[PDB]
RNA sequence: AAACUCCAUAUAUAUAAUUUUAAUUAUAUAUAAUUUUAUAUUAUUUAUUAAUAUAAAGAAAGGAAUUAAGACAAAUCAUAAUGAUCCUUAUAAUAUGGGUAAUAGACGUGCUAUAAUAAAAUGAUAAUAAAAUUAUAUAAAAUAUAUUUAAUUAUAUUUAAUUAAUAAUAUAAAACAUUUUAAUUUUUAAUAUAUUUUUUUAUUAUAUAUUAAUAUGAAUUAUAAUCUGAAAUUCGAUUAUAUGAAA
């Protein structure tokens, strides 16, 4: 009982902090439990099925833990862990994007003169 | 004026059967958009990289002849020993056997 | 267009006085010559202010009425031109060729 | 306003002891709707630090449990002048 | 700070001329929750009235009866709309589905 | 001035707009109504109405929850929110925004409008 | 500092078998300007001189990137990394909720008004753009309801085509015709007029009765209802009838 999460998962290869670990665990568990949520949601919001099936599906969908919620996946700076002003094109926060662009790491980015 | 609505509906039924499309005259909430959606789980999970990237630890099991050493970890160990000698350090953590 | 040009030339002041507080009290104003653009603006502001005092809900109608009045010489800004010209005649003395 | 066709928001909370016995239902589920079955049951709704007791009336039906458990209490400016 | 309306000089009602006070009242019929009707004297100009909630449909006054339906005012407020708004769920299925929670 | 249900009107006015303007429960659609039912043409000026038409309008409006009654509905609903001990109830009582509006910088309105007994 | 550079400019040359058409285009290379002369006038280190005048020839006129040294112990240990310290059953980890969102007076920066040089409704052989986005998408047409011929706006139902110089987001909108538009007796009816007829001239009504309180404004509230989500109670955006405050 020395692991901070119910199910053991690997470690990100690069920058690692506690919030990155939380987000990664949520991402992975959502990946393995994304089919269940879609099926349960269809059953619980379908009118044609019996209302008892609908009720039980909705109850279980509500009872699902938080680490399988699509709403709790947040984008973070893969180089810093910062979760503000994150460009999805590079998975980098604003300042890390600036420094990597000026340093040449990004594949095709360049300063804007126009 | 326009084509009979029954004729339009019949054409719709036939085309839907041919092309394998759902048909719903009444317009009830079938919730088919809940199912006909892509699984974004793989892409979402593969966000922080590949966890199996080679690490400095594995260089002993692979190429054991080369005697590598990492400045970062040596710096960490040197700082720890320096703290001990200077008198600072980390208090001993009491084991799990204490407390109720 | 000719009537409008004549009206502007007759209603636009020929001189005007600006403040020169760098000298002595009363700003020591000197009349200064104006260009065609400045004279036209001074005339047009008066024409518009006199046209806005009419009744028609349409600015085109009000402005046409006012321009017709000025063409027939019933403008209410001739006295403004006259006051400005008299002030210039009074301050002639302060003129100093720079 | 939650769409009616979705159905009322219902969460697993204990009611069998609430009716068979007089045990109140202490809960943090502030977003659950008050169904017609809860009238006469005693609830203890979490407000952030303490559980506020409330008895369900026939008029509360359709509302949310969290509407009767204020989380922040009123402001009072201390002028001292 | 108090507000009062002024007192006018009271008309003197002499000894022996003082009549009693007989206010105008109507023999009004008053229907209870059941079919029972009581005649009473009322000053309101309404000869007929019926009650929706009264003694004849109160548990405290009616202990022996097994079944007793209760009702309130109609066409007022949002009453009964918490039921009218949900038609999919209707009356014993919910009772069965409320068997237990299985939490500890 | 013409009068319908004891409200002074003006002869230049249009019925379809004046009804909504000076009745609590009338608006665009419900003023297109009444006019449509009684056959008054879309832009009558209300100085063209005959007395039978005036009383017909009066009867039709009296056949609706138009004024006073609608105020009663709204007041009763707010009173019920207070009675049930709702957050909205105390917002109304304290004269504060009830639809989740920031109160930190400007709530000048509803300080002078929100109350238990609203118009 | 200037130049060199990028977006723009002109020309050419090369690619596209002009059905990824936008050839009126796309982007690869080069040229051009940090413009040349000719007489005029003031002048003047005398002609070798500038400031203008402007016959001429040129397509030729902009924009942004770059902001040195020193400083203000300017901001940043909350982008991350760090020396000293200071927490080690906490100052380190998890979840359920509640905080960041409260409201007396202040203060910034914005949005929307307060009407006639100006705001709404209509404009289907659909007046006229540029630059972006779409495999963690996109939503054409069509059909249903709010609402009755439609249309227009909101939701649902189906999802066509395209991972895209090809489908889609997406018929830009203001302009510009037309109708209307309270304060305004500046108006609308009734009859009569007649060569102003989408119109004017008469006599009556439109007068609690001419200097601000709508047919402007859309804040604040009541009630259906709908999106997204497991879930809007504290706290999310939406149409619908009502509400219609300050200005
Ligand atoms: Mg570290
Ligand atoms: Mg998110
Ligand atoms: Mg009104
Ligand atoms: Mg430079
Ligand atoms: Mg410097
Ligand atoms: Mg500081
Ligand atoms: Mg750090
Ligand atoms: Mg904040
Ligand atoms: Mg700023
Ligand atoms: Mg306007
Ligand atoms: Mg507007
Ligand atoms: Mg167009
Ligand atoms: Mg384009
Ligand atoms: Mg469509
Ligand atoms: Mg327009
Ligand atoms: Mg308006
Ligand atoms: Mg608004
Ligand atoms: Mg608002």
UniProtKB/Swiss-Prot annotation, chain A:
The keyword DNA damage does not apply. GO terms for molecular function: structural constituent of ribosome. Keywords: Mitochondrion, Ribonucleoprotein, Ribosomal protein. One of its GO terms (cellular component) is mitochondrial inner membrane. InterPro entries: Ribosomal_uS14, Ribosomal_uS14_CS. Gene3D superfamilies: 1.10.287.1480. It is found in: Mitochondrion. GO terms for biological process: mitochondrial translation; translation. It comes from the Eukaryota. Component of the mitochondrial ribosome (mitoribosome), a dedicated translation machinery responsible for the synthesis of mitochondrial genome-encoded proteins, including at least some of the essential transmembrane subunits of the mitochondrial respiratory chain. The mitoribosomes are attached to the mitochondrial inner membrane and translation products are cotranslationally integrated into the membrane. Component of the mitochondrial small ribosomal subunit (mt-SSU). Mature yeast 74S mitochondrial ribosomes consist of a small (37S) and a large (54S) subunit. The 37S small subunit contains a 15S ribosomal RNA (15S mt-rRNA) and 34 different proteins. The 54S large subunit contains a 21S rRNA (21S mt-rRNA) and 46 different proteins. Belongs to the universal ribosomal protein uS14 family. This is Small ribosomal subunit protein uS14m.
From Swiss-Prot, chain C:
It is found in: Mitochondrion. It comes from the Eukaryota. Belongs to the universal ribosomal protein uS7 family. Component of the mitochondrial ribosome (mitoribosome), a dedicated translation machinery responsible for the synthesis of mitochondrial genome-encoded proteins, including at least some of the essential transmembrane subunits of the mitochondrial respiratory chain. The mitoribosomes are attached to the mitochondrial inner membrane and translation products are cotranslationally integrated into the membrane. Present with 1340 molecules/cell in log phase SD medium. Component of the mitochondrial small ribosomal subunit (mt-SSU). Mature yeast 74S mitochondrial ribosomes consist of a small (37S) and a large (54S) subunit. The 37S small subunit contains a 15S ribosomal RNA (15S mt-rRNA) and 34 different proteins. The 54S large subunit contains a 21S rRNA (21S mt-rRNA) and 46 different proteins. This is Small ribosomal subunit protein uS7m.
UniProtKB/Swiss-Prot annotation, chain D:
Gene3D superfamilies: 30s Ribosomal Protein S19, Chain A. It is found in: Mitochondrion. The keyword Cell inner membrane does not apply. GO terms for biological process: mitochondrial translation; ribosomal small subunit assembly. Its main location: mitochondrion. Keywords: Mitochondrion, Ribonucleoprotein, Ribosomal protein. Disulfide bonds: none annotated. GO terms for molecular function: RNA binding; structural constituent of ribosome. InterPro entries: Ribosomal_uS19, Ribosomal_uS19_CS, Ribosomal_uS19_SF. GO terms for cellular component: mitochondrial inner membrane; mitochondrial small ribosomal subunit; mitochondrion. Coiled coil: none annotated. HAMAP family: Ribosomal_uS19. Belongs to the universal ribosomal protein uS19 family. Component of the mitochondrial ribosome (mitoribosome), a dedicated translation machinery responsible for the synthesis of mitochondrial genome-encoded proteins, including at least some of the essential transmembrane subunits of the mitochondrial respiratory chain. The mitoribosomes are attached to the mitochondrial inner membrane and translation products are cotranslationally integrated into the membrane. Component of the mitochondrial small ribosomal subunit (mt-SSU). Mature yeast 74S mitochondrial ribosomes consist of a small (37S) and a large (54S) subunit. The 37S small subunit contains a 15S ribosomal RNA (15S mt-rRNA) and 34 different proteins. The 54S large subunit contains a 21S rRNA (21S mt-rRNA) and 46 different proteins. PANTHER family: RIBOSOMAL PROTEIN S19P FAMILY MEMBER, SMALL RIBOSOMAL SUBUNIT PROTEIN US19M.
From Swiss-Prot, chain F:
GO terms for molecular function: RNA binding; structural constituent of ribosome. GO terms for cellular component: mitochondrial inner membrane; mitochondrial small ribosomal subunit; mitochondrion; peroxisome; small ribosomal subunit. Keywords: Mitochondrion, Ribonucleoprotein, Ribosomal protein. It is found in: Mitochondrion. One of its GO terms (biological process) is mitochondrial translation. Its main location: mitochondrion. It comes from the Eukaryota. Belongs to the universal ribosomal protein uS13 family. Component of the mitochondrial small ribosomal subunit (mt-SSU). Mature yeast 74S mitochondrial ribosomes consist of a small (37S) and a large (54S) subunit. The 37S small subunit contains a 15S ribosomal RNA (15S mt-rRNA) and 34 different proteins. The 54S large subunit contains a 21S rRNA (21S mt-rRNA) and 46 different proteins. Present with 259 molecules/cell in log phase SD medium. Component of the mitochondrial ribosome (mitoribosome), a dedicated translation machinery responsible for the synthesis of mitochondrial genome-encoded proteins, including at least some of the essential transmembrane subunits of the mitochondrial respiratory chain. The mitoribosomes are attached to the mitochondrial inner membrane and translation products are cotranslationally integrated into the membrane. This is Small ribosomal subunit protein uS13m. The lineage of its organism: Eukaryota, Fungi, Dikarya, Ascomycota, Saccharomycotina.
């Amino acid at each position: 009982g020395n692991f901070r999460f119910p199910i053991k998962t690997k470690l990100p290869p690069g920058f690692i902090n506690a919030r990155i670990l939380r987000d990664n665990f949520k991402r992975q568990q959502f990946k393995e439990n994304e089919i269940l949520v879609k099926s349960l949601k269809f059953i619980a919001r379908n009118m044609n099925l019996p209302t008892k099936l609908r009720l039980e599906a909705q109850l279980k969908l509500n009872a699902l833990p938080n680490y399988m919620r699509s709403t709790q996946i947040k984008n973070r700076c893969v180089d810093s862990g910062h979760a503000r002003f994150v460009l999805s094109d590079f998975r980098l926060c604003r300042y890390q994007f600036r420094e990597n662009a000026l340093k040449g790491n990004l594949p095709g980015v360049k300063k804007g003169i126009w | 004026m326009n084509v009979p609505k029954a004729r339009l509906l019949k054409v719709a039924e036939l085309s839907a059967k041919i092309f394998d499309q759902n048909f719903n005259p009444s317009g009830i909430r079938t919730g088919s958009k809940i199912l006909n959606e892509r699984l974004k789980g793989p892409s979402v999970a593969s966000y922080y990289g590949n966890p199996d990237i080679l690490k400095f630890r594995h260089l002993k099991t692979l190429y054991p002849d080369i005697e590598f050493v990492d400045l970062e970890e040596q710096y960490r160990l040197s700082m720890v020993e320096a703290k001990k000698r200077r008198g600072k350090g980390a208090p001993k953590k009491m084991k799990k056997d204490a407390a109720a | 267009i000719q009537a409008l040009e004549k009206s502007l030339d007759e209603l636009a002041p020929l001189m005007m006085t600006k403040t020169f507080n760098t000298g002595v009290a009363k700003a020591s104003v000197i009349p200064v010559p104006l260009n065609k653009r400045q004279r036209n603006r001074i005339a047009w502001n008066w024409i518009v202010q006199s046209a806005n005092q009419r009744v028609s809900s349409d600015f085109a109608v009000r402005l046409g009425e006012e321009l017709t009045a000025i063409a027939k010489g019933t403008s209410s800004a001739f006295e403004k031109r006259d006051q400005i010209h008299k002030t210039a005649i009074a301050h002639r003395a302060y003129i100093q060729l720079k | 306003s939650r769409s009616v066709w979705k159905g009322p928001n219902i969460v697993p909370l204990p009611i069998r002891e609430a009716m068979t016995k007089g045990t109140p239902i202490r809960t943090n589920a502030r977003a659950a709707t008050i169904l017609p079955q809860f009238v006469g049951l005693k609830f203890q709704i979490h407000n952030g630090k303490e559980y506020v007791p409330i008895e369900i009336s026939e008029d509360m039906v359709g509302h949310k449990l969290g509407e009767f458990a204020p989380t922040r209490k009123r402001f009072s400016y201390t002028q001292t002048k | 700070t108090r507000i009062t309306l002024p007192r006018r000089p009271a008309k003197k009602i002499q000894l022996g001329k003082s009549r009693p006070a007989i206010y105008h009242q109507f023999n009004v019929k008053m229907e209870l929750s059941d079919g029972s009707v009581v005649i009473r004297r009322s000053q309101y100009p309404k000869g007929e009235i019926r009650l929706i909630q009264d003694q004849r449909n109160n548990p405290l006054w009616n202990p022996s009866r097994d079944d007793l339906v209760v009702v309130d005012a109609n066409s007022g407020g949002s009453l009964d709309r918490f039921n009218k708004r949900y038609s999919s769920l209707f009356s014993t299925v919910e009772l069965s589905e409320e068997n237990k929670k299985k939490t500890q | 001035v013409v009068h319908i249900l004891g409200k002074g009107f003006k002869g230049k006015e249009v019925i379809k707009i004046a009804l909504a303007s000076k009745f609590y429960g009338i608006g665009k659609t419900t003023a297109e109504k009444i006019c449509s039912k009684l056959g008054l043409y879309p832009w009558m000026r209300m100085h063209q109405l005959s007395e039978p038409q005036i009383m017909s309008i009066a009867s039709e409006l009296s056949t609706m929850t138009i004024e006073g009654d609608a105020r009663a509905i709204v007041k009763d609903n707010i009173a019920l929110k207070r009675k049930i001990g709702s957050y909205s109830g105390m917002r109304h009582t304290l004269h504060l925004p009830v639809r989740g509006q920031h109160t930190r910088n400007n709530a000048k309105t509803a300080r002078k409008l929100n109350k238990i007994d609203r118009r």
